């Protein structure tokens, strides 16, 4: 349904497989029953984390996620965004999996894979609001899994119905900006290692209320409200990255969203917008079923 590695998806070698809980996952589950301003990711905390890397010049392009031993999920706008003259071909990119350090070439840890083909949702709307901001990248050859490389699960209807609720927290990860960056400054820019932040899903009415940009059912927003005190948000560079939730039903990590867009980063009254993975999952299914798992 997604490719080799789906059966054991969402279970991390360094955590679930060892009956070890990461430092902030209980915060997520508590929200179900009860990157700016984030923190350094733990080793193997997000084994599905993928870094979209430009072949030449060598630079970080976006975040992404591993959904199988041969398929990588990301935001459509990460590969195609005409307004900024962006339109990559499978030949210009590489995917770096199992990474922690943003800049270091982590030999014997990370895996750099070439792309066989990229697919962008046919109805992706880059013109207005990045509607249907989803894309898939098939690796030239399957990658072997490791303590640092493991696919995330794609949500089924029941899991999505249960967890996609206002207040329910998800986890966003990426090597994106540590803060809104507009001009040269000696302050914090990009992180040294993968950043992680847990954020609550926001009620659709508030999401639409927070922006002049037209919101569609193919997206959802997350982040704390000003009155909630806590902060946190994805930022430029986190695009394409995963917004995951740990299922209380089978303790597997599911990707409910993809870092899509926002206005500024961690601004009061603003919320990060993510691609609604479940609602667009059937496209992923159609593509993978057509072009082999």
């Amino acid at each position: 349904t997604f490719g080799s590695g789906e059966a054991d998806c969402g279970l991390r070698p360094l955590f679930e497989k060892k009956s070890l809980e990461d430092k902030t996952e209980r915060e997520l589950l508590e929200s179900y029953i009860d990157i700016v301003e984030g923190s350094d990711a733990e080793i193997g905390m997000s084994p599905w984390q993928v870094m979209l890397f430009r072949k030449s010049p060598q630079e970080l392009l976006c975040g992404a996620s591993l959904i199988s031993d041969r398929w990588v999920l990301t935001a459509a706008h990460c590969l195609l965004y005409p307004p900024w003259d962006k339109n990559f071909t499978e030949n210009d990119l590489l995917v770096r999996i199992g990474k922690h350090s943003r800049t270091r070439y982590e030999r014997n840890i990370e895996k750099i894979s070439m792309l066989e083909k990229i697919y962008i949702h046919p109805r992706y709307n880059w013109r207005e609001n990045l509607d249907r901001d989803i894309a898939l990248m098939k690796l030239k050859k399957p990658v072997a899994f490791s303590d640092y490389i493991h696919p995330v699960c794609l949500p089924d209807r029941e899991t999505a119905a249960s967890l996609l609720q206002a207040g329910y927290k998800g986890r966003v990860t990426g090597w994106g900006n540590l803060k809104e960056t507009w001009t040269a400054n000696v302050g914090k820019g990009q992180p040294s290692v993968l950043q992680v932040v847990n954020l609550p899903i926001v009620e659709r009415p508030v999401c639409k209320d927070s922006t002049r940009i037209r919101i569609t059912d193919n997206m959802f927003c997350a982040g704390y409200k000003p009155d909630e005190g806590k902060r946190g948000d994805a930022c430029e560079g986190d695009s394409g990255g995963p917004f995951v939730m740990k299922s209380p039903f089978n303790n597997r990590w599911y990707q409910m969203g993809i870092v899509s867009w926002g206005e500024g980063c961690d601004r009061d009254g603003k919320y990060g917008f993510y691609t609604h993975v479940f609602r667009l999952k059937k496209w992923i299914q159609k593509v993978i079923d057509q072009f082999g798992e």
């Binding site: 890397f53 072949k55 030449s56 060598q58 630079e59 970080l60 590489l94 770096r96 943003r102 800049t103 270091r104 070439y105 750099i112 070439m114 990009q190």
Partner: peptide, 11 residues
Amino acid sequence: DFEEIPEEYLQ
């Protein structure tokens, strides 16, 4: 600022 990756990945 990015450590260069093995050239075998650029081919």
